[PDB]
């Protein structure tokens, strides 16, 4: 399901953007995580994978706050299960 | 189709597959232009493939 799939992305992007904070400030920094999801949506784990370390501090901190919601399917869940995020802030 | 053409494309949020990776930053092709996302993007298809804010950013090549 294509459509479902963008969606959930947009809800998990969504989450963690309403947790993460003064996002201009880190304007021209670059941030990389992975993931690993539950199937309830719960973050089981994450990992930065490089960039700006204060960057990178505030990444973490809006992702494990985040409400990531249950995926739509099992199937969309298996698609993000280890979904690689990035922060790059404009 | 110009660089000043793509430019004055707008904006979207949405995936793109068949991304790339030069330096810090990704990009993508679309309406034979290239795209680049900024912002916070989730990544999938073995990172190859990234939903977010993308904007046009030079012509196809």
């Excluded at chain 2, 949405?14 to 232009?33: H, I, M, P, Q």
């Amino acid at each position: 399901s294509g459509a479902d799939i963008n969606n959930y992305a947009g809800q998990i992007k969504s989450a963690i953007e309403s947790k993460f904070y003064d996002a201009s400030s880190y304007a021209g920094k670059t941030c990389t995580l992975r993931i690993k999801l539950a199937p309830d949506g719960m973050l089981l784990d994450i990992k930065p994978e490089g960039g700006d370390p204060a960057l990178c501090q505030a990444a973490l901190a809006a992702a494990k706050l985040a409400k990531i919601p249950k995926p739509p399917s099992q199937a969309v869940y298996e698609v993000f299960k280890n979904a690689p995020l990035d922060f790059k802030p404009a | 189709t110009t660089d000043a053409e793509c430019l004055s494309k707008p904006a979207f949020d949405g995936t793109l597959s068949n991304v790339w990776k030069e330096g810090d930053s990704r990009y993508a092709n679309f309406e034979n232009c290239i795209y680049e996302l900024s912002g916070i993007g989730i990544g999938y298809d073995n990172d190859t493939s990234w939903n977010g804010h993308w904007t046009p950013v030079r012509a196809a090549d």
